[PDB]
Write a protein that binds this ligand. Structure first.
Ligand SMILES: Nc1ncnc2c1ncn2[C@@H]1O[C@H](COP(=O)(O)OP(=O)(O)OP(O)(O)=S)[C@@H](O)[C@H]1O
Ligand SMILES: COc1ccc2ncnc(Nc3ccn(C)n3)c2c1
Ligand SMILES: OC[C@H]1O[C@H](O)[C@H](O)[C@@H](O)[C@@H]1O
Ligand code: NA
Length: 448
């Protein structure tokens, strides 16, 4: 009961979720308007990705993916399909980011990116090939066009100095000039949410929402042009990057924030920023569980009130451990092994408590995430005339894909909050790479 009283703090009633949903909708409306776009916690950044009236280039494309724990370079072949365009990743290489490069300047980081591109083109006999470049940049960008935009600020622990406020495409093109080895036609820069939505659209034309639940958490959707006041025109739709991770940054989530949320935030690389994301993302989930277990040990409710050296160190309870604990069949074998590796010798009840602590944090993440998506979907419903809105949501991220129960708790909670909406959820197959190449193929018809 004492353990259950502490875990009860993570509960969110239907009215709590509807309140989050309504406040998300409010912040989304505020971000789209000129008078409030600047002070808005939910930035609602125009991407310049429009509902295209046909015009795509076919062939091989080079796709870049910067945002995750590592960095990826891939080759994607695009062609004329039934729907419109098919796309397939043919070659790929993952590169790790060094400590001195992540701490170093923007020019140091982008030179390393340019060095990785050289390594890929050399080890694939294509340095002599002038390919259009597609760039998936999983960070908040204020766009001037499809191939132009400034980094607003780093998120998810990134720190490369002299990057914020500068044209990201400009940094990459300058780094390529600084090398002289190869030549790239940097054609498009898209967010990971956008890349995911675009790749899912060719499988289902009803896909007008992109959502990422991985290290970070964010969504994009197709907004009516007349509602995107930060761009000129009233015809068609434009994809808007909500940057919903920053919801709560103006105090919108204060009544829902817990001692563990406050501890994660103070110790993070961005204190006071990405608060909503800090309740959901894989960068923070395992850390939230760690802080809960530590509370239980101080209250003498877990491990006889004794925590290990590893359990008392930041980042030790990895997000994958949350997913592993919740995959346990009931024999406690998976929980025991995780805890033993963390230097603990848990009892049968300690294992059960750790499971409960994991479910409490991951259920809150799924429910909080659902209120956001329901907000986007109901906002889209309002700006349309039909009996039932049938919409497809394109999804990516390890938390949503790999966690044993997140997906289902999330789907059930979204459907509950979205009446007269028929939602289809599709997972992206190489969404970041294919999406960036698909946007690049259309953008090529105008620039290259
Ligand atoms: N089995 C797992 N279950 C749940 N979460 C996990 C699992 N494995 C890793 N993670 C976490 O999820 C994150 C990695 O998510 P990824 O899908 O690889 O996306 P990413 O490319 O690293 O960055 P973004 O923001 O999600 S596009 C890290 O924060 C991990 O701690
Ligand atoms: C739902 O809307 C869609 C669906 C699929 C798409 N595939 C490629 N490019 C798209 N849009 C682009 C690229 C460049 N611009 C100015 N607009 C695109 C837009
Ligand atoms: O990667 C998932 C998301 O993580 C962070 O919230 C970024 O600010 C956003 O650009 C990205 O889409
Ligand atoms: Na407009």
């Amino acid at each position: 009961t004492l353990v259950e009283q502490i875990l009860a703090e993570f509960q969110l009633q239907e009215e709590d979720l509807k309140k989050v949903m309504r406040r998300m909708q409010k912040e989304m409306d505020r971000g789209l308007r000129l008078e409030t776009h600047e002070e808005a916690s939910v930035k609602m950044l125009p991407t310049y990705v429009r509902s295209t009236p046909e015009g795509s280039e076919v062939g091989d494309f080079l796709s870049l993916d910067l945002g995750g724990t590592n960095f990826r370079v891939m080759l994607v072949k695009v062609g004329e399909g039934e729907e419109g365009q098919w796309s397939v990743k043919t070659k790929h290489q993952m590169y790790s980011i060094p400590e001195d490069a992540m701490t170093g300047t923007a020019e140091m980081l982008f030179d390393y990116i340019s060095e990785c591109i050289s390594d890929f083109l050399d080890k694939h006999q294509m340095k002599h090939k002038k390919l259009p470049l597609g760039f998936t940049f999983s960070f908040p960008v204020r766009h001037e066009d499809i191939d132009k935009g400034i980094l607003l600020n780093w998120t998810k622990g990134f720190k490369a100095s002299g990057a914020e406020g500068n044209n990201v495409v400009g940094l990459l093109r300058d780094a390529i000039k600084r090398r002289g080895d190869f030549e790239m036609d940097v054609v498009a820069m898209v967010n990971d949410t956008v890349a995911t939505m675009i790749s899912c659209y060719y499988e289902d034309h009803q896909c007008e929402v992109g959502m990422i639940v991985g290290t970070g958490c964010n969504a994009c959707y197709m907004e009516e042009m007349q509602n995107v006041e930060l761009v000129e025109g009233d015809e068609g739709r434009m994809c808007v990057n909500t940057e919903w991770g920053a919801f709560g940054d103006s105090g919108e989530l204060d009544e829902f924030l817990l001692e563990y949320d406050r501890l994660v935030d103070e110790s993070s690389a961005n204190p006071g920023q990405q608060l909503y994301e800090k309740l959901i993302g894989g960068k923070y989930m395992g850390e939230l569980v760690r802080l809960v277990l530590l509370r239980l040990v101080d209250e003498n409710l877990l491990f006889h009130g004794e925590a290990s050296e590893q359990l008392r160190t930041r980042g030790a309870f990895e997000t994958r451990f949350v997913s592993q604990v919740e995959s346990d069949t009931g024999d406690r074998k998976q929980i025991y092994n995780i805890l033993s590796t963390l230097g603990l010798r848990p009892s049968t009840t300690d294992c059960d408590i750790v499971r409960r602590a994991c479910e409490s944090v991951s259920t809150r993440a799924a429910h909080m995430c659902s209120a956001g998506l329901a907000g986007v979907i109901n906002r889209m419903r309002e700006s349309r005339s039909e009996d039932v809105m049938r919409i497809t949501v394109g999804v990516d991220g390890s938390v949503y894909k790999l966690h044993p129960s997140f997906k289902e708790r999330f789907h059930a909670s979204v459907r509950r909050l979205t009446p007269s909406c028929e939602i289809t959820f599709i997972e992206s197959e190489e969404g970041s790479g294919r999406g960036a190449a698909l946007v690049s193929a259309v953008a090529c018809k105008k620039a290259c």
